[PDB]
């Protein structure tokens, strides 16, 4: 009936003065725009149909055409930034916000979806959706005693749209909007649906990626223990955003990092640092690097949890990016650690993998490793053991690497390698 | 010395309803 229409037939039907013909044509457009391959979005836009769909959004007495037009506009706004912009330029934002209060759950769901696409375009349309007043009705849709009474798809769509309202960072979302959304986000973060949990964790990760004041807004809500719990989850779609959020949080002040530590996060890193998923290993090692850049008692907590051998393992064998994160962790550890902590690090076997990594073609990691070596040598000096560390570095073949670095492109590598060779060798 | 950042993939920014 409304399958495989031509855009010309759709235009004829919508340009008729017959609401039912308009509805059939709008459904035909929806079915065209919801097909598997190559939906004719640009042809629909060229025909000037967006303003008609937007007007149909306000037909309270014809809920079917409201739903059909909402779906069509949702699929148009899901495309390029120019197609989303075409939807916005037709006045769709306030119409969808008004539809958020529809008595029909499927229509309000479609409005939530469309606003999610518009906000997901980027920070400008996100902030414009916020300025039109979307947050209040969106959150009102979730103001129920128990989230389990809502349909799973409805709740997942609401969570995804809210996460898009927390997304992007040039500029970051308005502070007032973040504060208005956060409690509902915590609620959702305690839900039992894995997709809701994943998207809520992703929203928290968005909100924690930035200045330490944003991290503080998030941490003050008491979400860190739940984030650690989810970090322990069996589903990787949940562990990934939880780990991102935890890493973001430990990029902040020593007190925020301490909040992460007090919640028991380190006990999970034996698994994360050996996780078969490369991205998990990389981001866990990055998190560890930011924790080793903390205070000496926090480095000591890293030591007590037995995580130094796991850093040695990652440095010894892993994807090169994870090995770079591990080099960063080692340099931070040696820069901020006590003499006893650096001695412990050496006793765990860091020297050999550190040296084997000096044969890489990435200048940054070479600089990081040479700085770590300098710090360890300073500790040795304080202990009067410089010659023994020298012998160790020679035995594993690191002396030859440092000598080769003496003739390197970068000036810092040149200088540091020559300083090491002339002061300790 | 703290270094800020820069299915298991992040949620899609936009979603078509098939």
Residue numbers in the entry:
A (entry chain A): 72 to 496
B (entry chain B): 277 to 282, 297 to 308
From the paper:
For MCPyV LTA, nuclear import so far has been believed to rely on a monopartite cNLS (NLSm: 274‐PFSRKRK‐280). However, our structural and biochemical data suggest that MCPyV LTA NLSm could also function as a bipartite cNLS, together with the monopartite cNLS located 20 aas downstream (NLSct: 300‐PPKPKKNRE‐308). Strikingly, all other tested cNLS peptides bound as bipartite cNLSs (NLSbip), occupying both the minor and major binding sites of IMPα2ΔIBB with their upstream and downstream basic clusters, respectively. For all bipartite cNLSs, the IMPα2ΔIBB P2 major site pocket is occupied by a K residue, forming hydrogen bonds with IMPα2ΔIBB residues and a salt bridge with D192, whereas the P2’ minor site pocket is occupied by an R residue, forming hydrogen bonds with IMPα2ΔIBB residues and a salt bridge with E396. To this end, several expression plasmids were used to transfect HEK293A cells, before CLSM imaging and quantitative analysis of nuclear localization levels. As expected, GFP‐MCPyV LTA NLSbip localized to the nucleus to higher levels with respect to GFP‐MCPyV LTA NLSm. Consistent with the subcellular localization data, MCPyV LTA NLSbip bound to IMPα2ΔIBB with higher affinity than MCPyV LTA NLSm. Furthermore, the K280T substitution completely abrogated IMPα2ΔIBB binding to MCPyV LTA NLSm but not NLSbip. MCPyV LTA is unique in that it contains two cNLSs which preferentially work as a bipartite cNLS, with the upstream NLSm binding the minor and the downstream NLSct binding the major IMPα binding sites, respectively. The increased interaction interface observed in the bipartite cNLS structure reflects the increased binding affinity observed for this peptide in our binding assays with IMPαΔIBB isoforms. We identified for the first time a hybrid bipartite NLS in MCPyV LTA, formed by two basic stretches of aas which can either simultaneously bind the IMPα minor and major binding sites as a bipartite cNLS, or, upon deletion of the genetic sequence encoding for the downstream basic residues, selectively bind to the IMPα minor binding site.
In the best characterized pathway, importin (IMP) α bridges cargoes bearing basic, classical nuclear localization signals (cNLSs) to IMPβ1, which mediates transport through the nuclear pore complex. IMPα recognizes three types of cNLSs via two binding sites: the major binding site accommodates monopartite cNLSs, the minor binding site recognizes atypical cNLSs, while bipartite cNLSs simultaneously interact with both major and minor sites. We combined bioinformatic, biochemical, functional, and structural approaches to study this phenomenon, using polyomaviruses (PyVs) large tumor antigens (LTAs) as a model. We addressed this possibility by x‐ray crystallography, and solved the structures of putative bipartite cNLS peptides of MWPyV, STLPyV, WUPyV, KIPyV, and MCPyV LTAs bound to IMPα2ΔIBB.
